[PDB]
């Protein structure tokens, strides 16, 4: 079952005395006329932000609550109990029965089975309300005990709840339960939200009445005036603001295809020891289209996934290219050993680009053997990352400098691959392209294809036109820019037209319907009905009597054909009255 609170769950926000003073507060309250669960006699509930909790009986079936996140061991929880003696607050790590309770001989307490690591102890019909909240490691408890003249139904009325306890625990809470005394020989749960209330203080300092300032237009007016009686008139109470849904973002097509099509499709690559190195500049490089050219044999990157490179941007891209064996592709990797990855190429350990490699046995190898690819094997030291050595000096191995004539312990530094088409993979020619990116300080270079969503119209939207960020309704235009102008401005300098980069059409930008909200009341001493004016808003975009005026959209009043003396002035010749009531 569910039930309706009426005006319930008001607590004194803090100490500090006070008398007749319609004082205004912002806090966590139980909104007026709320949807409170009903329980009879129970299960694990949430907490999520404070709790209202009433209960009704003459016996005592409700014997405290249990709180926490897991209601077991492995994390801490609170336990608040009351046998026929008195209250027992306690904070340990427990092991709670999934259905914990206490009996009524009169032997009881099948509640838990563990009391480890206790960090806090304490020991020592009817309507009993409680408000539980938990802020900054303090667990606050307000309470009130009113006598009903019923037995177990939620009554109506006003009664403010006075603070009881304060516990500096530190405990996290996400769930709570209840405890009941069995048979061996009715309760509600509200939740609290951040509201703003207007409390009326007595001359002794007690809260006697309140106003929830977000219930209806009358209450928002009472809050705006800081009173409990509004006299006839018309009052500005707040503001409206048509919210914008979605948000398009469309840039221009792609010009500089960014020519990978000759670094991957060149007729003749470089050898490895004098490896090629291209530098790419300002272009539109689509990495996913490069990814599925559908012939590769290694596509591996370390700094970044390839598909999420389609929405970054860099300053400079280096693309090295060469040709090596089959069994040496494992050397083109960060932190390797072996000739290649130590003689004709070295990667740094914090690499970021993609290594790409594929087979080209049918193109670079030939019967008799293509011997035109040279690789270095002799060097007096290792190499830096991205170093390059194109010299051809005669290396001396031994102690004897031999001076330009080879023989024992001095050799030529370069050998040649013999690429024969009757070879197994492991001596076959593989072509290798290594990318690397850098972001030094440069203004703008190669970026990706900024996903340009579809352009919508006639809806308050959040838009971006290749840099122009804004909000508003977009509409087909009938102005004519000059064919180099992107957007138009008004006097007082606000963007009011744009040109769509892709289709090149002019679109006006009008703001989102906004304005004030006014409440028309005959006075609370006459009635509590209300009418509402949305000022200069078209009455079709507001969220009976909906009536359109030159002054806005009026809701809650009927339009008649008579004409009286003016009572409450709306505007543009229109007045309102409480006559025909309504």
């Amino acid at each position: 079952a569910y039930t309706n609170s009426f005006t319930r769950g008001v607590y004194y926000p803090d100490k500090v005395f006070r008398s007749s003073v319609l004082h205004s507060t912002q806090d966590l309250f139980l909104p007026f006329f709320s949807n409170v669960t009903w329980f009879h006699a129970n299960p694990v509930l949430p907490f999520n932000d404070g709790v209202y909790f009433a209960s009704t009986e003459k016996s005592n079936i409700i014997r405290g609550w249990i709180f926490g996140t897991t209601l077991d061991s492995k994390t801490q929880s609170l336990l608040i109990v009351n046998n026929a003696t008195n209250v027992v607050i306690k904070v340990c790590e427990f092991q709670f029965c999934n259905d914990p309770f206490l009996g009524v001989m009169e032997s009881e307490f099948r509640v838990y089975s563990s009391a480890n690591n206790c960090t806090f102890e304490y020991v020592s019909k009817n309507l009993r309300e409680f408000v539980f909240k938990n802020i900054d490691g303090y667990f606050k408890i307000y309470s009130k005990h009113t006598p009903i003249n019923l037995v177990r139904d939620l009554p109506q009325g006003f009664s403010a709840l006075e603070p009881l306890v304060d516990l500096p625990i530190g405990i996290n809470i996400t769930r709570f339960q209840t405890l009941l005394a069995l048979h061996r020989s009715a309760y509600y749960v509200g939740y609290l939200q951040p509201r703003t209330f207007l409390l009326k203080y007595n001359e002794n300092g007690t809260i006697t009445d309140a106003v929830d300032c977000a219930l209806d237009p009358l209450s928002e007016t009472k809050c705006t005036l800081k009173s409990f009686t509004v006299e006839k008139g018309i009052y500005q109470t707040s503001n409206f603001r048509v919210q914008p849904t979605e948000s398009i973002v469309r840039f221009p097509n792609i010009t500089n295809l960014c020519p990978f099509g000759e670094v991957f499709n060149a007729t003749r690559f470089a050898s490895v020891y004098a490896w090629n190195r291209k530098r790419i500049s300002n272009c539109v490089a689509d990495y996913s289209v490069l990814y599925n050219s559908a012939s590769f044999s290694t596509f591996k990157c370390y700094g970044v996934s390839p598909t999420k490179l389609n929405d970054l941007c860099f300053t400079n891209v280096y693309a090295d290219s060469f040709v090596i064996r089959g069994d040496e592709v494992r050397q083109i990797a960060p932190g390797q050993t072996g000739k290649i990855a130590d003689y004709n190429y070295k990667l740094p350990d914090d690499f970021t680009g993609c290594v790409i490699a594929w087979n080209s046995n049918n193109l670079d190898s030939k019967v008799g053997g293509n011997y035109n690819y040279l690789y270095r094997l002799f060097r007096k030291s290792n190499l830096k990352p991205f170093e390059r050595d194109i010299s051809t000096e005669i290396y001396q191995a031994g102690s004897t400098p031999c001076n330009g004539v080879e023989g024992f312990n001095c050799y030529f530094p370069l050998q040649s691959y013999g690429f024969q088409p009757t070879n197994g993979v492991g001596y076959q020619p593989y072509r290798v392209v290594v990318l690397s990116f850098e972001l030094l300080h440069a203004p703008a270079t190669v970026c990706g294809p900024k996903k340009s969503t579809n352009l919508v119209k006639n809806k308050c939207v959040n838009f971006n036109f290749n840099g122009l960020t804004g909000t508003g309704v977009l509409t087909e235009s009938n102005k004519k820019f000059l064919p180099f102008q992107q957007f138009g401005r008004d006097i007082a300098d606000t963007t009011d037209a744009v040109r769509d980069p892709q289709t090149l059409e002019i679109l006006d930008i009008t703001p989102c319907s906004f304005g004030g909200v006014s409440v028309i009341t005959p006075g609370t001493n006459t009635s509590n009905q209300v009418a509402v004016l949305y000022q200069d808003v078209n009455c079709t975009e507001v969220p009976s009597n909906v009536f359109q005026t030159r002054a806005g959209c009026l809701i809650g009043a009927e339009h008649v054909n008579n004409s009286y003396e003016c009572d409450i002035p709306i505007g543009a010749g229109i007045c309102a009255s409480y006559q025909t009531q309504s």
Partner: antibody
Amino acid sequence: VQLVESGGGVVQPGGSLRLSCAASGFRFDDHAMHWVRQAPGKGLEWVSVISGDGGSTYYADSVKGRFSISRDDSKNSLYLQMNSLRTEDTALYYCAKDRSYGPPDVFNYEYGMDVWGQGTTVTVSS
Amino acid sequence: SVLTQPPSASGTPGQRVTISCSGSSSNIGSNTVNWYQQLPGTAPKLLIYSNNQRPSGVPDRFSGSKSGTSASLAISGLQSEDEADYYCAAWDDSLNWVFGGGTKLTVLG
């Protein structure tokens, strides 16, 4: 272009086995090899791979340290030596050929497993 | 390293049926998928390697898609001989080949 296996049977838990797989129709220095087991009625489960051109092997984590795998291109064969079995190894074992060798670790983007054997049943118990 | 995929799919014979797989970042992120068909009793066949490339002998009813971190087989028009298990594979930088959970077919004829 064929793959046969041999070596299964019944051993008690604690024993050892030697599975073998013989291939025909291609060279072994152009392809990597896989041992893939499958419990009866259930899905597949990769066990081990050896690359072509010598050795760079990998095992699945639940079978780490217990097993060993080698190849022999003088005889065109695979050997999978199994030591200290447990009762969760009752399965068919398949000898699969991986086109384009090099552990899937280095030669990414194109590995596959094109041709398969007929499998060999092995079960354990007392 | 789990490669979650549905356990069984369905469809009338003669229309397109998709089969999905979802791996995280070491599975489908930086690697490629394969698809394997297992008719009941036989050895498994290869269907798709390198995310969309059927080898010789696979008919033109099977395709393949890889989008970011998901993959998808797409059988275009079922028939009386495609009632089998289908597995997706990956490599997982974790240093271990991973397999799918399999998916039966239920021509429902």
